[PDB]
Amino acid sequence: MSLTDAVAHLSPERWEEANRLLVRKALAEFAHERLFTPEPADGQDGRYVVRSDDGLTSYRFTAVRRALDHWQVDAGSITRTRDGAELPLAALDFFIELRHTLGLSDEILPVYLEEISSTLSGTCYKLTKPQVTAAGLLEGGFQALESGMTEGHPCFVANNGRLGFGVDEYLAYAPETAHPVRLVWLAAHRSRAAFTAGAGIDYASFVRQELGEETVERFDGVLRGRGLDPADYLLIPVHPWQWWNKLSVTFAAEVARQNLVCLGESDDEYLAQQSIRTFFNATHPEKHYVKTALSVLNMGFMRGLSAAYMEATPAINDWLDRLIDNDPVLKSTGLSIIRERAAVGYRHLEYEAATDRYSPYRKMLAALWRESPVPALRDGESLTTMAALVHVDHEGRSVAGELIARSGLAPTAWLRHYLRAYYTPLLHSFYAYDLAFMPHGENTILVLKDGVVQRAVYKDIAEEIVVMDPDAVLPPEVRRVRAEVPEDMKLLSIFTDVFDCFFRFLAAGLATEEVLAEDDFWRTVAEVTREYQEAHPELDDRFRQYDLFAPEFALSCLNRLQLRDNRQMVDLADPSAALQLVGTLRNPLAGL
Amino acid sequence: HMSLTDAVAHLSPERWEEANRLLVRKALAEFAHERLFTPEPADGQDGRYVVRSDDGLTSYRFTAVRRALDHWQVDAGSITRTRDGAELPLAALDFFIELRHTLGLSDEILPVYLEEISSTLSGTCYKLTKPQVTAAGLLEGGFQALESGMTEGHPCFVANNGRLGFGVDEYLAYAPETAHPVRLVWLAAHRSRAAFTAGAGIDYASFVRQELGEETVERFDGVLRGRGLDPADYLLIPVHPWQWWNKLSVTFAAEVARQNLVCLGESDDEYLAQQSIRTFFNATHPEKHYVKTALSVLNMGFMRGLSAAYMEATPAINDWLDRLIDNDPVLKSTGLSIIRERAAVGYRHLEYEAATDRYSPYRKMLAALWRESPVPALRDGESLTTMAALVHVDHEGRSVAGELIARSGLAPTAWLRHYLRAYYTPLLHSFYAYDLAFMPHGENTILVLKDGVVQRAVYKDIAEEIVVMDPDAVLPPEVRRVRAEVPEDMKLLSIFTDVFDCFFRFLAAGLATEEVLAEDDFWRTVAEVTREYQEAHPELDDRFRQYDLFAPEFALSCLNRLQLRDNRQMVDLADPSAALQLVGTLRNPLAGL
Ligand SMILES: NCCCCCN(O)C(=O)CCC(=O)NS(=O)(=O)OC[C@H]1O[C@@H](n2cnc3c(N)ncnc32)[C@H](O)[C@@H]1O
Ligand SMILES: NCCCCCN(O)C(=O)CCC(=O)NS(=O)(=O)OC[C@H]1O[C@@H](n2cnc3c(N)ncnc32)[C@H](O)[C@@H]1O
Ligand SMILES: [Mg+2]
Ligand SMILES: [Mg+2]
């Protein structure tokens, strides 16, 4: 409410800590992407230095170098020097001084600085939260972990901008604040809107289950009072931010003409997940997630949702689900997906006429419902986002460290269970089906029992999967997920997304934490890779064609994508084109 | 603040239909005026014209009365839309899509322009829910009832009331037609980044104590002391709540966190947004200054922030022009005054300066100025109104100019003469005797009324708008930047375009339709007032012949074409003559007369 309370989290001490942490990450991850090469130090062994565009400002730091060109920069070691004088660490100055070394055009730079300022504000807010250990997050439970995550995506520096949120909207809607949100419900006329049902879904029963017979009837009452037949309308849940700031103005014609009718708030209370636009039902955890369209800029993309793509989303989930159920190799890993079960899209005829297929004006009003992983739990089982494995608390304990400890297992035995539940299905998906995911910490959930990973749950399916075989035999609703990927890039779905974008941080984390040395981590990864491959000699050709044990693989840079284009990191027509490969990495599996 | 359903209650099928007919009516009228299309008579029926879509398959048929300066009085009730032989609904969005190439809307601008149209229509829908007030009713309600009772906005621009950036709740809070009180947000800005510029006679410490009262000033100092800070190191900047909550608190979060900016809280006084949206009248204490704020919202061809750099020169330019009017008996005899911009504050964001060019909107996000109120100078029986009221037509067909003429008891030409001497003649003298042009449209001009008659004009929005069209003219240093090189054949368009084609065209047409004053009598009176001025100053006969206001024709300077070409920056500020779009000529009504 208060003017002064809304920015109270922005204090000099928290701002200083946020800037140190962000610059540390910038030094580490821009080094990794070879945007700059830290020259060895003036005499000191682990010391390094990086210089501004003009050479006159120097950032000196210490760093432990680790596998996959990992740089763990010590935050407390960083110093900013100019003319022999120390200057305060400032992320904004850093990016301006390096504007040309990084590919930051004159057009992108001020927006990127906003994303940086916004990320730093988020860190300040997170610093005001009660301190919680890895043990406390686990004892807190599923949403305690979800809203307790602090880092966000570990590669991207400008990863938590949420551009579009005012400070009051940040407090209301950001996942790390965990404030309950009531979704806005609209009635959408069937001439413009369409509901697509997964197998076994019926619109009428679906909306009764999810809203309650009482609310459906109240909504039908509001429509009939306006002279509208409820049989002409479909329900669409919308994010409050999207309604107040976008739909009520941009779609004012549709509202005024009663193609859209605002019904009011949901009775249930929802919690934003790490993707921001996707909500978990806190009142009834068994009910579906709701994924909304949110025309906010975060980490390289506007986070709307395509009305057109909703038509085939549940069919792609029904197909993948049956594929897993009918493959004993996947069924034995325990893999499951939480299916996208129903979807609604609104086709704005006029904005479609005025734009092209790639326009964000076509991604402003749509929603899908996704199964909750809670009812499937057995006695003693619990859920965590895979992103928790690389979350480190204020005592230096990662949540993976705490799990290993509580499990009583040797680290490699614990790591083997995790890899069998999470990594093995990726190998089988790749080699037996040309199938790839986007399996980062936010798209993966882990089922825990006795501290041990029992199985993995994948989500965000229809927007993310790809069958890397244009001639692949699929049912028609699914064929749009095929794509031509160059041969020497197909295996990057493992090399980049798993090894260099997640395992790199998990292995380095567990080593610094004195839980598991790097070599023992990557040996376990090799052992699990061989445990799969030796079980299926019929695929030996493909194991040779796509060598996970090759000496090197390509360095596929992630921040460079956002630096080149922070509105749309990859073209969705040709996503392989946007990749920026910059030399090679030594593969840890080689020789193993 | 309010209900989900209440906030969009004004958007109903009936009001949306009415708003769309009104907007298409204006689009047909003003685009025909700018020759974006040339309406052809349909089937020969006298009065019936037709305008077709890009492909020619859709027809917009309508009737219109044509008047001076290629003015098209399109009848809103007459418009029909026809394609494939069947009537279609009047939809402003489909109209612009169907005519996208004819109007020159690129693929990049069209979807944003549609947003501006949709928002302008939503505003018309809100205004259609308000209690209906007559021209007499508005005059009886007074200065702010007239300000917030205006409905048209700029009379040429079709997408004139976009305010893109307002959500529907922020529209209801902040739009001037809603007249809802606003409390400004106050920031303390560190004096290493912020400057306070005082006009002649202003002292910072006394100025902020007049405007806020000692009690609030001491409270704000207490906020700083509570944070361990020295009030002596800071100055006060008022900001628009929208700007604070949506932009400054995020974009300037580094400045807030480091206590270069400190959020102090809210003003006690209640402010009312004027027609410029970003400038506030003090409802609680009308004698106090207007406050003009930076508001990074897109409206009618420009983002409406306020440059901090330009604040250092702003009071000085007003002090210069105020003295210039006091020391000129031609202007003193017309009664002309300005409400001076008396004080200004700018915040220099060092990092965004380093990261942008001079003309970046990131340098226009934090700045304010205080402008004199025109109220305490009023004598017994005097009232204020925006000049926009003259072309405001109520629901009964009566303009406020109509009601004023009636109430005055004078003959329309005599009423008009009083108006012309207060408002128009000072522009003539300014151009001829000083090479000085304004932006003197309805929103930048206030009229003082007594017994129904214009007593004198008040000009505002000075530092940002005036131009001295003489690079070699002698001026004090802070004023020299308003000098500019304007082509010879264009210097007079500051009268022809800004006065005749963009305001008198509507006022003369309105009074003619209202059956109050015929066009010929209107323009004859203007001609007569022009000769009265010229014959009284023969020492300027050279310039009078050099810039012939009685030429047979002058350039058609098109306004909507500017916003259709670039709807974020209609003109470049370094070279504003370059952006103009001249399309043929107009028959000057003063030619015969
Ligand atoms: N073939 C892939 C090669 C890499 C190309 C780069 N690229 O397009 C991506 O990395 C996609 C990133 C992405 O947007 N994934 S998403 O669609 O599933 O969105 C995830 C959202 O959640 C946020 N977020 C918060 N916390 C995390 C963590 N811990 N990991 C990942 N993402 C997180 C993201 O910012 C995003 O908004
Ligand atoms: N010699 C000049 C040739 C014409 C160049 C075209 N051009 O740049 C303009 O017309 C700019 C007009 C302008 O923005 N004037 S402003 O800076 O004072 O903006 C005024 C604001 O008030 C709004 N508004 C509401 N109602 C009116 C009326 N009746 N007249 C004018 N303006 C009005 C405007 O939309 C704007 O936001
Ligand atoms: Mg996701
Ligand atoms: Mg103005």
DSSP A62-109: EEEEETTTEEEE-GGG-EEEETTEEE---HHHHHHHTTTTTT--TTTH
Q: How far apart are CA B308 and CA B317, in angstroms?
A: 15
Sort strands B58-67 and B80-83 into parallel, antiparallel or unpaired: antiparallel
Atom of ligand 1 nearest to the CA of A299: 35
Do A257 and B166 count as a contact with CB atoms less than 8 A apart? no
CA distances from B207 to B44, B127, B201, B202 (A): 67, 37, 10, 6
- Please, what sign has the CA dihedral across residues B135, B136, B138, B139? positive
Query: Hunting for tokens 């928790």 — which residue is that?
Result: A388
Q: What tokens does A318 get?
A: 């029904």
Kindly identify which residue of chain B lies nearest to residue A162, measuring between CA atoms: B250
Do A351 and B246 count as a contact with CB atoms less than 8 A apart? no
DSSP conformation class of A273: -
Q: Which of A469, A480, A388, A380 is nearest to A432 (CA)?
A: A469
Give me ligand 2 centre to Cα B154, in Å. 6
Radius of gyration of chain B (CA): 24
Ligand having the closest approach to the CA of B467:
2
Which residues does B39 contact at the CB level (< 8 Å), separation at least 6?
Answer: B28, B32, B49, B50, B51, B62, B64, B72
Do B351 and A110 count as a contact with CB atoms less than 8 A apart? no
Q: Is A233 helix (H, G, I), strand (E, B) or coil?
A: strand
For B34-50, b/e burial (b = at least 16 CB within 10 A) is bebbebeebeeeeebbb
Instruction: Among A248, A295, A297, pick the best mutation site for testing chain B contact (most B Cβ within 10 A).
Output: A248
Residue A330, CB-side half-sphere exposure with 13 Å CA sphere: 23
Query: Hunting for tokens 């003219």 — which residue is that?
Result: B473
The secondary structure of B358-421, three-state, reads: CCCHHHCCCEEEEECCCCCCCCCCCEEEEHHHHHCECCCCCEHHHHHHHHHCCCHHHHHHHHHH
Q: Does A172 touch chain B (CB under 8 A)?
A: no
Q: How far apart are CA A231 and CA A66, in angstroms?
A: 61
Q: Name every chain A residue with its beta carbon within 8 A of the beta carbon of B357.
A: 106
Which residues does A515 contact at the CB level (< 8 Å), separation at least 6?
Answer: A398, A400, A401, A404, A411
Q: Which of A494, A503, A382, A500 is nearest to A436 (CA)?
A: A494
Give me ligand 2 centre to Cα B305, in Å. 14
Query: How big is chain B, counted in residues?
Result: 593
β-pair partners for A289: A370
Q: Does A356 touch chain B (CB under 8 A)?
A: yes
Distance from CA of residue B430 to its chain's centroid?
20
Q: How far apart are CA A538 and CA A532, in angstroms?
A: 12
Ligand having the closest approach to the CA of A465:
1
Q: Which strand (E) or helix (H) includes residue B37?
A: none
Residue A178, CB-side half-sphere exposure with 13 Å CA sphere: 13
Q: How far apart are CA A400 and CA A392, in angstroms?
A: 9
Q: Are B147 and B274 in contact (CB under 8 A)?
A: yes
Q: How far apart are CA A166 and CA A6, in angstroms?
A: 10
Q: Are B385 and B274 in contact (CB under 8 A)?
A: no
Count of Cβ atoms closer than 10 Å to residue A145 Cβ: 22
Instruction: Among A16, A120, A167, A362, pick the best mutation site for testing chain B contact (most B Cβ within 10 A).
Output: A167
Q: Are A468 and A485 in contact (CB under 8 A)?
A: yes
Q: Which of A98, A67, A66, A64 is nearest to A80 (CA)?
A: A98
Q: Does A245 touch chain B (CB under 8 A)?
A: yes
Q: What is the DSSP secondary-structure string of B318-360?
A: HHHHHHHHHT-HHHHHHT-EE--EEEEEEE--HHHHHTS-TT-
Q: Name every chain B residue with its beta carbon within 8 A of the beta carbon of A225.
A: none
The secondary structure of A187-227, three-state, reads: EEECCCEEEEECCCCCHHHHHHHHHCHHHHHHHHHHHHHCC
Query: Hunting for tokens 């693929």 — which residue is that?
Result: B107
Sort strands A39-40 and A260-265 into parallel, antiparallel or unpaired: unpaired
Q: Is A476 helix (H, G, I), strand (E, B) or coil?
A: helix
Count of Cβ atoms closer than 10 Å to residue B592 Cβ: 12
Angle, to 10 degrees, between the axis of helix A411-422 and the axis of helix A399-407? 110
For B538-550, b/e burial (b = at least 16 CB within 10 A) is eebeeebeebebe
Do A168 and B245 count as a contact with CB atoms less than 8 A apart? yes
Do B4 and A262 count as a contact with CB atoms less than 8 A apart? yes
How many interface pairs between A and B have CB atoms less than 8 angstroms apart? 144
Backbone angles phi, psi at B295, to 5 degrees: -140, 95
β-pair partners for B557: B582
| Ligand 1, CB cutoff 6 Å, lining residues | A 152-153, 159, 274-276, 298-299, 301, 387, 438, 440-443, 460, 496-497, 558, 561, 569-570
Which A positions 547-586 lie with beta carbon below 8 A of chain B?
A: none
Distance from CA of A230 to the nearest CA of B (A): 18
Atom of ligand 2 nearest to the CA of B387: 29
Give the closest of B246, B256, B352 to A7, CB-based.
Answer: B256
Q: How far apart are CA B452 and CA B414, in angstroms?
A: 12
Q: Which strand (E) or helix (H) includes residue A396?
A: none
Q: Which of A264, A76, A303 is nearest to A183 (CA)?
A: A264
Q: How far apart are CA A404 and CA A417, in angstroms?
A: 11
Q: Are A388 and A289 in contact (CB under 8 A)?
A: no
Give the closest of B122, B250, B263 to A166, CB-based.
Answer: B250
CA distances from B161 to B121, B202, B237, B443 (A): 8, 35, 27, 13
Sorted by where each begins, the domain ranges of chain A are 1-131, 132-179, 180-379, 380-587
Sort strands A278-281 and A270-272 into parallel, antiparallel or unpaired: antiparallel
Which technique was the structure solved with, according to the deposited record?
X-ray
Ligand having the closest approach to the CA of A459:
3
Q: How far apart are CA B524 and CA B522, in angstroms?
A: 6
Q: Does B258 touch chain A (CB under 8 A)?
A: yes
Q: What tokens does A566 get?
A: 């922070």
Burial of B582 (0-12, 13-18, 19+ CB in 10 A): middle
Q: Which residue type sits at A412?
A: T
Do A249 and B357 count as a contact with CB atoms less than 8 A apart? no
Q: How far apart are CA B182 and CA A9, in angstroms?
A: 26
Q: Name every chain B residue with its beta carbon within 8 A of the beta carbon of A353.
A: 97
Angle, to 10 degrees, between the axis of helix B110-129 and the axis of helix B13-33? 120
Q: Which residue type sits at A343?
A: A
Give me ligand 1 centre to Cα A275, in Å. 8
Q: How far apart are CA B555 and CA B53, in angstroms?
A: 27
Q: How far apart are CA B542 and CA B487, in angstroms?
A: 18
Sort strands B453-459 and B337-338 into parallel, antiparallel or unpaired: parallel
Q: How far apart are CA A77 and CA A20, in angstroms?
A: 10
Radius of gyration of chain A (CA): 24
Q: Does A354 touch chain B (CB under 8 A)?
A: yes
Q: Which of B38, B50, B45, B54 is nearest to B98 (CA)?
A: B54
Do A4 and B250 count as a contact with CB atoms less than 8 A apart? no
Ligand having the closest approach to the CA of A275:
1
Q: Which residue type sits at B86?
A: A
Which B positions 3-42 lie with beta carbon below 8 A of chain A?
A: 4-5, 7-8, 11-13, 15-16
Kindly identify which residue of chain A lies nearest to residue B100, measuring between CA atoms: A354
- Please, what sign has the CA dihedral across residues A242, A244, A250, A255? positive
A500 — alpha (psi -120 to 50), left (phi > 0) or beta?
alpha
Give me ligand 1 centre to Cα A441, in Å. 9
Q: How far apart are CA B571 and CA B471, in angstroms?
A: 20
Ligand having the closest approach to the CA of A153:
1
Q: Where are the beta strands (DSSP E) in A305-354?
A: 336-337, 340-346
Q: What tokens does B242 get?
A: 């929208």
Q: Where are the beta strands (DSSP E) in A138-281?
A: 184-189, 193-197, 233-238, 260-265, 270-272, 278-281
Q: How far apart are CA A12 and CA A27, in angstroms?
A: 22
Q: What tokens does B185 get?
A: 């947000």
Kindly identify which residue of chain B lies nearest to residue A353, measuring between CA atoms: B97
Kindly identify which residue of chain A lies nearest to residue B252, measuring between CA atoms: A117
Q: How far apart are CA A171 and CA A164, in angstroms?
A: 13
Q: Which of B211, B163, B480, B175 is nearest to B345 (CA)?
A: B211
Distance from CA of B387 to the nearest CA of A (A): 30
Which residues does A400 contact at the CB level (< 8 Å), separation at least 6?
Answer: A388, A389, A390, A506, A509, A510, A515
Q: How far apart are CA B298 and CA B302, in angstroms?
A: 6
- Please, what sign has the CA dihedral across residues A182, A188, A193, A199? positive
C-beta pairs of A139-146 under 8 Å, 24+ apart in sequence: A141/A382, A142/A285, A142/A374, A142/A382, A142/A383, A142/A384, A143/A178, A143/A271, A143/A280, A143/A282, A145/A384, A145/A385, A145/A388, A145/A399, A146/A175, A146/A271, A146/A273, A146/A274, A146/A280, A146/A385
C-alpha angle A38/A41/A42, rounded to 5°?
Answer: 145
Give the closest of B5, B107, B355 to A262, CB-based.
Answer: B5
Q: How far apart are CA B61 and CA B284, in angstroms?
A: 50
Q: Which residue type sits at A503?
A: F
Distance from CA of A119 to the nearest CA of B (A): 10
Q: How far apart are CA A332 and CA B256, in angstroms?
A: 55
**What residues flank ion ligand 4 with Cβ within 5 A?**
B 276, 444, 461
CA distances from A472 to A337, A426, A457, A536 (A): 22, 18, 25, 21
The secondary structure of B123-158, three-state, reads: HHHHHHHCCCCCHHHHHHHCHHHHHHHCCCCCCCCC
Which residues does B178 contact at the CB level (< 8 Å), separation at least 6?
Answer: B126, B148, B171, B172
Q: Which of B135, B187, B136, B160 is nearest to B391 (CA)?
A: B135
CA distances from A78 to A43, A378, B495 (A): 16, 48, 63
β-pair partners for B88: B81
Give me ligand 1 centre to Cα A391, in Å. 16
Q: Which strand (E) or helix (H) includes residue A140?
A: helix A134-140
Residue B313, CB-side half-sphere exposure with 13 Å CA sphere: 16
Q: What tokens does A178 get?
A: 């965990």
Q: Which of A482, A418, A425 is nearest to A449 (CA)?
A: A418
Atom of ligand 1 nearest to the CA of A575: 1
Q: Does A105 touch chain B (CB under 8 A)?
A: no
Q: How far apart are CA A408 and CA B387, in angstroms?
A: 83
Distance from CA of A240 to the nearest CA of B (A): 10
Q: What tokens does A438 get?
A: 């986007």
